[PDB]
Amino acid sequence: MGRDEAGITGTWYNQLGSTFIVTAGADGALTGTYESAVGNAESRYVLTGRYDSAPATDGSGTALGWTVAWKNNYRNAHSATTWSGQYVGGAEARINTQWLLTMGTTEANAWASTLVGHDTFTKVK
Amino acid sequence: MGRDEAGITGTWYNQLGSTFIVTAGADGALTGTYESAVGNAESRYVLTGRYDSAPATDGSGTALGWTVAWKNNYRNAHSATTWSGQYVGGAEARINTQWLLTMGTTEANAWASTLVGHDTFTKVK
Amino acid sequence: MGRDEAGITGTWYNQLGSTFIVTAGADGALTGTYESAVGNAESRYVLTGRYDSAPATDGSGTALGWTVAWKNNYRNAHSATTWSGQYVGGAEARINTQWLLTMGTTEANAWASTLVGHDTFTKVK
Amino acid sequence: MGRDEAGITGTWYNQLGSTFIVTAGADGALTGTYESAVGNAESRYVLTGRYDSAPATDGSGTALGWTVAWKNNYRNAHSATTWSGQYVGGAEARINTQWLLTMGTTEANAWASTLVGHDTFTKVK
């Protein structure tokens, strides 16, 4: 019932080898789990987000985003990442994203609190 | 039961005059609504996110993030913003954030798909 | 001879207490020195950049940017920051910027190579 | 005389088909020209920047950055982009960057003034 509800739901892999498992709801919800292949992270972490459930019909991608806070039963990196991007459907479907990773810091170090990057997710590898 | 569950839950206002109403769950969940004072937006939009429910005890802020997809019953801007930041408690409590706003685009225009900025939220104004 | 050649040339201070001394050329050049109040930095570092020497006449700001590589005779942080922003003239003139700070890394750590932030520069403090 | 003075000097091409011609100075200077394959741009634009002329010797990349203001004799987009990244040498040498593109805006629209992205440059294509 979302246009890309079906295209988005499932398992995605990025260039780092991380795994994003997501379910897209009819209404715009994203829920799932994230496992990072890098960094101070082990096992799965909860994720939540949103997507545009009625995208433009002119060949544009589907805007979406989601957040992981890097606390689970195993580790707590006192950090959260948000990914902002778009889903592009078709035989080589992709989710192209940029992300912001904020670490909790003291006020003195807050200038250095946020990393930025980019991840591309595919349905294989 | 989250350390800052109580400090985060409520109504926050940014420098633009936008309003963020959020509830923080014991486990790390953020749910609420967002109303932008600017842009191609009207009324409230759903938001979801995550926060670190066991932050460092050394005066560091609390990492968190959340997403709004800019579709509601009134408008659809075919866009999503994610905010990444930290909550800082005390008499002048703040949520200091950076954000990424992705518009759905064609592949040809994808280079120009993402705006970046920064918002600071307070409990007054 | 640049519209804001005169408004930009001089000494500017950001929210951190850093000092940016710049000369703007008629043709679009920015040259000067930068002294960071924070981080792995001591004394002055060379900076170079560019500005729009014929901005729009409708009350818009003046786009500009510049780079510092964090090597001088005292220290080498194996890093470079670029600021992208706009100059806004008038009784409270400002340069509002966002910045990207890249550290040289191994390929394995390149995902974590770039910090992002924002600085606002004024003619006082 | 810079460690990567020779590796950086020359002609580079990004994923968009843009062309970056640069000379690296012994002391850390970058000078050259940029031609964008996309956007409101025609022909070459001046660029200036900086690089770390004494990078770490442990296989880390070489931090660098540069700026283009999008005014030349043909067009003026009232914008500037800064790229922040690192040079990685070897048989497949690359410059991996993130960038910030600021448009001059009114104060009311300044929230929407800055695009963010990422470009990867190679010596072929």
Task: Please give the Cα distance from C118 to C99 (Å, whole number).
Answer: 6
CA distances from B38 to A22, A99, B19, D110 (A): 31, 23, 11, 11
**C90 CB-near residues (< 8 Å, 6+ apart):** none
Q: Are strands D19-24 and D29-35 parallel, antiparallel or unpaired?
A: antiparallel
Report the neighbours of C using a cutoff of 3 or more CB pairs below 8 angstroms.
Answer: A, B, D
Q: Is the dihedral of CA B66, A44, C110, A110 positive or negative?
A: positive
Q: Which amino acid is at D99?
A: W
Task: Please give the Cα distance from D78 to D39 (Å, whole number).
Answer: 13
Residue pair A68/B64 in contact by the 8 Å Cβ criterion: no
Residue pair B2/B53 in contact by the 8 Å Cβ criterion: yes
Location of structure tokens 């109040």 = C37
Q: Which of A5, A22, A45, A52 to mutate to test the interface with B (most CBs of B within 10 A)?
A: A52
Cα atoms in the Cβ-side hemisphere of radius 13 Å centred on C67: 31
- D112 chain-B contacts, CB cut-off 8 A: 38-39, 115, 117
Residue pair A25/C98 in contact by the 8 Å Cβ criterion: no
Of C96, C98, C19, nearest to C62 (Cα)? Answer: C96
Please report the resolution in angstroms.
1.6
Of B24, A23, B112, B49, nearest to D99 (Cα)? Answer: B112
Token digits for B1? 């039961």
- Output the CA angle A31-B116-C64, nearest 5 degrees: 170
Q: What are the beta bridge partners of residue B115? A: B101, D115
CA B16 to chain centroid, in Å, comes to 13
Is A112 strand, coil or helix?
helix
Q: Which amino acid is at D97?
A: T
Is D89 strand, coil or helix?
coil
Residue count (chain C): 125
CA distances from C26 to C2, C47, C63, D34 (A): 5, 17, 15, 20
Task: Please give the Cα distance from C36 to D9 (Å, whole number).
Answer: 29
Chain A nearest-CA distance from B63, in A, is 5
CA distances from D117 to A84, B69, B109, D13, D47 (A): 12, 20, 12, 16, 18
Q: Which residue of C has its CA nearest to B100?
A: C116
Chain B nearest-CA distance from A55, in A, is 6
Q: Which residues of B touch C (CB under 8 A)?
A: 98, 116-118
Strands of C52-107, DSSP E = 62-71, 76-88, 94-103
- A116 chain-D contacts, CB cut-off 8 A: 98, 116
Residue pair A20/A11 in contact by the 8 Å Cβ criterion: yes
For residue B95, give the H/E element and its range.
strand B94-103
Q: Which amino acid is at B59?
A: G
Residue pair B125/B13 in contact by the 8 Å Cβ criterion: yes
The answer to whether the Cβ–Cβ distance between A98 and B114 falls below 8 Å is yes
Task: Please give the Cα distance from D37 to D16 (Å, whole number).
Answer: 6
Domains and CATH numbers, chain A: 1-125 (2.40.128.30)
Q: What is the rounded end-to-end Cα distance, in angstroms, of chain B?
A: 28
CB atoms within 10 A of CB D75: 14
CA distances from A114 to A3, A34, A80, B32 (A): 33, 20, 10, 24
